[PDB]
Each structure stands twice: as C-alpha cells, then as structure tokens.
Amino acid sequence: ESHIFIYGGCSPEKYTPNTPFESNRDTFLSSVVTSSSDASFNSFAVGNDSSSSSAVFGLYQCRDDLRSSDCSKCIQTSVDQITLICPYSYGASLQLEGCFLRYETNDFLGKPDTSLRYKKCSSKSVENDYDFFKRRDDVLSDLESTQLGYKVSRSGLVEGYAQCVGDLSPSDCTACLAESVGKLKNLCGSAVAAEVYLAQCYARYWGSGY
Ligand SMILES: *[C@@H]1O[C@H](CO)[C@@H](O)[C@H](O)[C@H]1NC(C)=O
C-alpha cells in the first residue's frame, strides 16, 4: 500500500526548542494534516523573513491516483515519520510510496529544481532483448509528455509512472520529467526496473511478467 518508506533527507542546520521556528514548523505540519482531508496537494508559508525566528515554507503531494481518506492517512503517517527521522532540522523532505512532504526555511515554492534526490536501479538487468528497451523508450517518452499531475504508461510488459509536484507550472513539469527520464536512462541503463526522484517530480518504470 501507500505507506512504505522510499527516502528522506534533512538539512544539516538544526533549530533549537522554544523558538518561533519550532512553533512555525508545528503550525505548518498541523496545516498539512488539516489540508489533507480534501486536497491531494497544497502549498504553505508560515511567518516572516529572518535563525530561530525564521519562516517555514513547505508542501505535500499525495499520489493523485488515490482516494481522499488514503491521502490523509499517508500524510498523518508522514508528519509523524518526518519528525522521527529529522528531529530538529530547519529543512526536511520525506517520500513514502503514497505521499511526499517537504519544508524548508527558504522559499522554494514554484521554482524549478531538477536536482537528484534519490534513485534506485533494480539489481536484475535485461540483456539481449532489444524489444524491452524499445518499449521502455516508448513508455518513458509518454511519461515525459505529462504537464499536470500523473501519467500511467504501458507498452508490452513495460509499465511506467510519473508524477509532478503540484507547485510546478506545465512547462516546468515537462522539463522536470525530461530530466527524470534522462537520469533513468543514464544511471540505470539496463535495469528491468528503476526509479528517479528529483526535487519537484519523479518517474519509475518496471517489467510486468519479467
Ligand atoms: C517580515 O517582517 C519584516 C520586519 O521584520 C518586514 O521587513 C517584511 O516586509 C515582512 N515580510 C513578510 C513576508 O511578512
């Protein structure tokens, strides 16, 4: 289901208890849970430019192909987990199968960012199967076409999934996924299955009966 751990990262810079930033962070996470109920994505800014007094900027993105109640469950789990693995971080991100949660002290909302956050290539490689690679190419090409939300793609026994985070413009979503696919090709050349997660999007492919 939608709750297994994919990756997490925290800022090296830590905040101290009983500061405005701690308060702002709590308020943010509380808002994320509230917003969960009836939106799959939302953006937030709490507070004022500063550091202990700093503003918080953040967002969450649930898998767009999942129900309301499932998005809330995932986000509640996410708020608990991100606190657990990143106790006193000024910045943190967390990707579960079902949802993504991010906050920082800098205003990253809406800005393109294609930096690599996480990737995994399957240990099993396909060899002597040109057809597999052509089908992968067709799938990845279709994923790259995404402008809003998510795409599921399929060609033969090759399946793919891509998602843009809801703070991106269409043009920026296309560019982000273009970089994802480039990365899938260049880091995981021969893998039967791989995933690449950038700052503002991700893309995965896998073999079905492979
Ligand atoms: C934050 O407060 C400072 C004064 O300390 C002010 O210069 C600035 O305009 C404010 N910005 C926001 C976003 O409230």
Author numbering: 25 to 74, 78 to 237
Structure paper excerpt:
The Domain of Unknown Function 26 (DUF26; Gnk2 or stress-antifungal domain; PF01657)18,19 is an extracellular domain harboring a conserved cysteine motif (C-8X-C-2X-C) in its core. The third class of DUF26 domain-containing proteins is the PLASMODESMATA-LOCALIZED PROTEINS (PDLPs). PDLPs contain two DUF26 domains in their extracellular region and a transmembrane helix, but lack a kinase domain. We defined the structural relationship of tandem DUF26 domains by determining crystal structures of AtPDLP5 (residues 26–241) and AtPDLP8 (21–253) ectodomains to 1.25 and 1.95 Å resolution, respectively.
The DUF26-A and B domains in PDLP5 and 8 closely align, with root mean square deviations (r.m.s.d.s) of 1.6 and 1.2 Å when comparing 89 corresponding Cα atoms, respectively. The DUF26-A and -B domains in PDLP5 and PDLP8 have 24% and 30% of their residues in common, most of which map to the hydrophobic core of the domain (including the six cysteine residues forming intra-molecular disulfide bonds) and to the DUF26-A–DUF26-B interface. Consistently, the ectodomains of PDLP5 and PDLP8 belonging to different phylogenetic clades closely align with an r.m.s.d. of ~1.6 Å when comparing 198 corresponding Cα atoms. These observations suggest that evolutionarily distant DUF26 tandem proteins likely share the conserved three-dimensional structure. Notably, Glu130 and Arg132 implicated in mannose binding in Gnk2 are replaced by Asp131 and Lys133 in the DUF-A of PDLP5, respectively. A similar pocket is found in the DUF-A domain of PDLP8, but not in the DUF-B domains of either PDLP5 or 8. We next explored potential binding sites in the two molecules by analyzing sitewise ω for orthologs of PDLP5 and PDLP8. Low ω values were observed in structural context, indicating conservation of residues buried inside the DUF26 domain, while variable residues (under more relaxed selection) appear on the surface of the structure. The different surface charge properties of related PDLPs from Arabidopsis suggest that different PDLPs and other DUF26-containing proteins sense a diverse set of ligands. Notably, we observed typical lectin-dimers in PDLP5 and PDLP8 crystals, in which two lectin domains dimerized along an extended antiparallel β-sheet.
